[PDB]
């Protein structure tokens, strides 16, 4: 009647990968919580794009999802720019 | 490709299994999702660096990630 519950602590991206991506973005220092933040937001991103892609392959009838479908779905996202135009 | 492939593929397939799509993903498609995830996250961290600098902070905090996220209007 005494149970320890299962938990997924990688959540798709490792710690060295997170730190490396943060350095490639110019971040020289982070709080450890960043890890659980990144693992969270990454999911959301995939959660969006996968949906955006699958409905694509759902509207044009197919049993599989091409990389072109996820490029389309990626362009179906918003494009943030550092300036005006 | 900075993200190790095995945990990432695992996560992607789990997300697909929540949507109950039961549609196999092209290997190159999951690869594209990985590359896009890398580019996304790196841009995020640039925005968080800017946010922390404007906050008089060297250390970036989850708040900086959330603000960098809402400034782009995502969930």
């Amino acid at each position: 009647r005494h149970r320890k519950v299962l938990r997924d602590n990688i959540q798709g991206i490792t710690k060295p990968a997170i730190r490396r991506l943060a350095r490639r973005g110019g971040v020289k220092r982070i709080s450890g919580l960043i890890y659980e933040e990144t693992r969270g937001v990454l999911k959301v991103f995939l959660e969006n794009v996968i949906r955006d892609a699958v409905t694509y392959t759902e509207h044009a009838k197919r049993k599989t999802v091409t990389a072109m479908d996820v490029v389309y779905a990626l362009k179906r996202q918003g494009r943030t720019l550092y300036g005006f135009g | 490709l900075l993200i190790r492939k095995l945990p990432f593929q695992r996560l992607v397939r789990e997300i697909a299994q929540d949507f109950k799509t039961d549609l196999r993903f092209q290997s190159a498609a999951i690869g594209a999702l990985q590359e896009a995830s890398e580019a996304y996250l790196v841009g995020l961290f640039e925005d968080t660096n800017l946010c922390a600098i404007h906050a008089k902070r060297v250390t970036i905090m989850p708040k900086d990630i959330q603000l960098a996220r809402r400034i782009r209007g995502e969930r």
Binding site: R1, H2, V5, R7, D8, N9, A22, R23 | T59
Partner: peptide
């Protein structure tokens, strides 16, 4: 706490309590 990022093993799953 804070982690200095300038070039400074994590299994897949772990288990804790709460049943």
């Amino acid at each position: 706490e804070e982690i200095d990022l300038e070039e400074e093993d994590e299994s897949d799953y772990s288990e804790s309590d709460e049943d």
